Design a protein around this ligand. Structure first.
Ligand SMILES: CC(C)[C@H](NC(=O)N(C)Cc1cccc[nH+]1)C(=O)N[C@@H](Cc1ccccc1)C[C@H](O)[C@H](Cc1ccccc1)NC(=O)[C@@H](NC(=O)N(C)Cc1cccc[nH+]1)C(C)C
Lengths: 99, 99
């Protein structure tokens, strides 16, 4: 689709069989989701932004579906204010900025 | 233009005759710029992100030019690592997300 930015670009994702909403975020390098149990082994990591650093769990090779498009990649899980879809997965689904 | 997301979407902006670089950021509601001393009246404000909150100064009605495109609006100034262009100015330049 083409998404305008008058409101926040929140979409539905599917992951681990759940439905969530997430934010399509060109200002993020990585994907961060709220705390949840995913299958698989994980590594403790840190990530930062405005305000500082949070501890997350890194999950590799996770399948995720974003408005019906599949992406397979790294997800960080942890105490984020909002579910963030970053540039690591936006590129997989062919996302660009246009003006 | 069409900007791809392989790298961070940094573009050149002009603010006050000064050129700078800034991140085009669909996940930010607000525009946030590195410390500088603008003329005009400011409000104190706090904005949040991943690790918590920072203190910023709010300027209103600031003109910025983003890749030859003018936008006018509110800007927050503070101790940010990166200049961030958020949806408040991105919408004015006609910027969309496409996939
Ligand atoms: C999510 C996280 C992995 C990401 N970090 C990175 O991508 N990093 C650290 C890579 C990097 C390093 C050096 C230089 C540039 N990039 C990030 O926080 N990116 C933010 C930009 C930034 C980078 C580095 C250092 C400081 C800032 C931009 C994101 O869009 C971020 C996403 C987010 C939104 C809401 C809550 C938490 C995170 N926005 C923000 O932090 C904005 N907040 C914001 O808009 N709100 C709090 C309102 C809101 C609420 C809900 C939904 C949307 N918006 C700020 C910039 C104003």
């Amino acid at each position: 689709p083409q998404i305008t930015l008058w409101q926040r670009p929140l979409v539905t994702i599917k992951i681990g069989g759940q439905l969530k909403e997430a934010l399509l975020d060109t200002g993020a390098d990585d994907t961060v989701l709220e705390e949840m149990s995913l299958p698989g082994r994980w590594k403790p990591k840190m990530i930062g932004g405005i305000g500082g650093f949070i501890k997350v769990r890194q999950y590799d090779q996770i399948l995720i579906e974003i408005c019906g498009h599949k992406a397979i990649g790294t997800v960080l899980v942890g105490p984020t204010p909002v579910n963030i879809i970053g540039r690591n997965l936006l590129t997989q689904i062919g996302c660009t900025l246009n003006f």
